[PDB]
């Protein structure tokens, strides 16, 4: 079982890289997770601290493993006042568009009750593969708000 439950969201494999490496630092801050690739609305309950990642395809497509979920949200709008979230965009970040893909999935879940947590963070893929500034700094600033 989880209790961070990540939403990995990418064809590429980029977000299943960072959810993976993202998953370690927590079981290592001794949180249980799991990295499930494009779930549907239909296979999340309406309460929990769930993690959505997904690429931005240089346009603002949302990778076709995850994009149904917005459909899926904004089609039932749901009662979501109880999940929490987190939102990371990953992309070549010279583009035009600008880790913008997942905006629109943690806007329905914003517009179906939910909040997010933290701050939305962007990850460059273009030229390094991060350089600098670990999601484990942000990861840290998450773990201190959603105990």
């Known amino acids: 079982m989880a209790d961070i439950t990540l939403i990995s969201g990418s064809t590429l494999g980029?977000?299943?890289?960072?959810?993976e490496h993202l998953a370690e630092k927590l079981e290592e801050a001794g949180f249980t997770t799991e990295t499930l690739h494009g779930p549907?609305?239909?296979?999340?309950?309406?309460?929990?601290?769930?993690?959505?990642?997904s690429s931005?395809?240089?346009?603002?497509d949302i990778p076709d493993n995850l994009s149904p979920?917005?459909?899926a949200l904004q089609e039932q709008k749901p009662d979501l006042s109880a999940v929490?979230?987190?939102?990371?965009?990953?992309?070549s970040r010279e583009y035009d568009t600008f880790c913008g893909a997942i905006d629109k999935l943690e806007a329905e879940l914003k517009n179906s009750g939910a909040?997010?947590?933290?701050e939305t963070l962007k990850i460059n893929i273009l030229d390094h593969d991060i350089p600098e500034d670990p999601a484990e700094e942000?990861?840290?600033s998450w773990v201190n708000l959603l105990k």
């Open 40 to 53: 549907l609305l239909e296979d999340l309950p309406a309460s929990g601290i769930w993690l959505v990642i």
């Open 138 to 140: 942000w990861l840290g």
């Open 14 to 19: 980029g977000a299943e890289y960072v959810a």
């Open 84 to 91: 929490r979230f987190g939102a990371i965009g990953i992309g």
């Open 56 to 60: 931005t395809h240089g346009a603002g």
């Open 69 to 71: 979920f917005y459909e």
């Open 115 to 118: 909040k997010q947590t933290g």
